[PDB]
């Protein structure tokens, strides 16, 4: 709901891939060196369908 709707609606497509944005719109403990790669892998490359492979994962 929250994460999915915010990520999809906002990122259309954030133009310059504004990373420093939705990373703060995420819960749990922040400042980790783990969740970083799970966002730079979805935004581009396999566009459109990748944004549907993100939520399911």
């Amino acid at each position: 709901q929250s994460q999915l709707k915010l990520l999809v609606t906002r990122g259309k497509e954030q133009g310059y891939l504004t990373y420093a944005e939705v990373n703060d719109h995420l819960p749990e403990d922040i400042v980790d060196s783990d969740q970083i790669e799970d966002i730079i892998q979805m935004i581009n490359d396999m566009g459109i369908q990748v944004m549907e492979e993100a939520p399911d994962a």
Partner: protein
């Protein structure tokens, strides 16, 4: 509107939330949650506008 989206309701929950935001790991206590916030904008050894 800012208050409407604010989970915290008092001083303890606020300092604890801030402590969990700054140092995400160890369970926030009483001394740690307070001393950390004090050592951010209210201590010369940790903050100074010169």
């Amino acid at each position: 509107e800012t208050l409407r989206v604010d989970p915290t309701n008092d001083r303890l929950s606020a300092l604890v939330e801030i402590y969990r935001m700054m140092r995400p790991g160890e369970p926030p206590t009483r001394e740690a949650a307070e001393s950390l916030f004090e050592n951010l904008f209210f201590s010369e050894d940790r903050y100074d506008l010169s």
